[PDB]
């Protein structure tokens, strides 16, 4: 009972690349059918961490539920949530990954944020997020109002502090900036905490899953 990915990569599918939402949703599958060289993946360029490990974790699943870990319109009262890009276009229209939110400043401010989530799903929860590395200082100031930014992510099984490095990368899909993608599996009962003062590409949707 295989999961057909079509023109998408696991990266495209799991992040919610706009071209990848046309695929039929599944709650279980024995293996993953995926084109050798898939067209749509990370529509916004960046490094996807532990990618091979993640494909293996997702290889076979007995239960799969997408849920809104951090509701878009509720979680972020003092930040702007509408961020979109032509690099992630859908129907000729600038857009973004279904499963992440591009947070930016609001009314001249990007207030320190702290958002936590407790896994009460009784199944492992796959959580994904990103860290944005602007191509220059102008974009850094315009988006986040802060030049010295950090993103911090913590649970019982994950602990990292990220800092953007602002500089040009080779132009890919019309971007010289980058987004690095990260993920963790959260134990039942464990809590994960995100803190940032800029540059967080927040989780919007997460995945409760079983593998056997």
């Amino acid at each position, epitope marked *: 009972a295989p999961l057909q990915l079509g023109n998408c990569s696991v990266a495209g599918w799991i992040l919610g690349n706009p071209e990848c939402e046309l695929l039929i949703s599944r709650e279980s599958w024995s293996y993953i059918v995926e084109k050798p060289n898939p067209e749509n993946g990370t529509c916004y360029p960046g490094h996807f961490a532990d990618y091979e490990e993640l494909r293996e974790q997702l290889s076979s699943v007995s239960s799969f539920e997408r849920f809104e870990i951090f509701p878009k319109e509720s979680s972020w009262p003092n930040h702007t949530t509408t*961020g*979109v*890009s*032509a*690099s992630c276009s859908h129907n000729g229209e*600038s857009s973004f990954y279904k499963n992440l939110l*591009w947070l*930016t400043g609001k*009314n*001249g*401010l990007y207030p320190n944020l702290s958002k936590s989530y407790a896994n009460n799903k009784e199944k492992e929860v796959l959580v994904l997020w990103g860290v944005h590395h602007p*191509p*220059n*200082i*102008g*974009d850094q*100031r*315009a*988006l986040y*109002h802060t030049e010295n930014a950090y993103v911090s992510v913590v649970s019982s099984h994950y602990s990292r502090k990220f800092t953007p490095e602002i500089a040009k990368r080779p132009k890919v899909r*019309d971007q010289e900036g980058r987004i690095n993608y990260y993920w963790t599996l959260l134990e039942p009962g464990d809590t994960i905490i995100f803190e940032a003062n800029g540059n967080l590409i927040a989780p919007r949707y997460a995945f409760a899953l079983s593998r056997g």
Partner: antibody, heavy 126, light 99 residues
Framework: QVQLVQSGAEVRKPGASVKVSCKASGYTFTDNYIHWVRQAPGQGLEWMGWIHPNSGATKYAQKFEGWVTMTRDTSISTVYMELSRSRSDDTAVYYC???????????????????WGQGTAVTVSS | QSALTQPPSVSVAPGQTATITCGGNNIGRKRVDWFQQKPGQAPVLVVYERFSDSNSGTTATLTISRVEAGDEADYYC???????????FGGGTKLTVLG
């Protein structure tokens, strides 16, 4: 509705301070950047910098950095532009403009200048 | 002379179509704000069936269809330069409606 009203024309001697004010109304003052742009007689428009009334953060054009100071008073919805050491160079009309045109993408994340003040004529002579 | 390049002057008879071009680095991938300035007045942001906008590579174009007397003005293009965090204005185009 939304408008910016600036103070009146000024004549100053060089080396003196020139302070121009801009009062905003018709909207929430703390929402938007306020820019200053100037126009010398017979010439075009040159950006001087902005101030955000909410944070008080400022940014000046390289050419004006160190010569100009922008401030805000939220209680009276007014921003100021000040030339601390004025020169004959500084004779021009000065505008304030509200940056209320919201950007549609993070690819080009710049708020556009949608509402301008009427301008203040500043003359600097000894 | 200016970071953005505009033709110094355009003259057009009423009813005709006026076209104003703006040249600049990566202009085609940005929003180019146009400003209309009439004599003795402050600039106003040009907002928009007559007035339309169109970019391409290093060229942004403001098109005014069926020109009227109230269209006569100086027009300035403007963008934000990402790298130096700096607002830049074109040198302006004096648009005359031949009356």
């Amino acid at each position: 509705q939304v408008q910016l009203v600036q103070s009146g024309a000024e004549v100053r001697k060089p080396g003196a301070s020139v302070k121009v004010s801009c009062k905003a109304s018709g909207y929430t003052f703390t929402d938007n950047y306020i820019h200053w742009v100037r126009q010398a007689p017979g010439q075009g428009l040159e950006w001087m910098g902005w101030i955000h009334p909410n944070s008080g953060a400022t940014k000046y054009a390289q050419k004006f950095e160190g010569w100009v100071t922008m401030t805000r008073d939220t209680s009276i919805s007014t921003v100021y532009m000040e030339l601390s050491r004025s020169r004959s160079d500084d004779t021009a009309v000065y505008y304030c403009a509200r940056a209320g045109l919201e950007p549609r993408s993070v690819d080009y994340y710049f708020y556009g200048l949608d509402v301008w003040g009427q301008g203040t004529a500043v003359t600097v002579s000894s | 002379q200016s970071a953005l390049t505009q033709p110094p002057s355009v003259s057009v008879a009423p009813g005709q179509t006026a076209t104003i071009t703006c040249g600049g680095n990566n202009i085609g991938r940005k929003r180019v704000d146009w400003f209309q300035q009439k004599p003795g007045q402050a600039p106003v942001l040009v907002v928009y069936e007559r007035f339309s906008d169109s970019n391409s590579g290093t060229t942004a174009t403001l098109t005014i269809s069926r020109v009227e007397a109230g269209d006569e003005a100086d027009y300035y293009c403007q963008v934000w330069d990402s790298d130096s965090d700096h607002v830049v204005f074109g040198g302006g185009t004096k648009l005359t409606v031949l009356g």
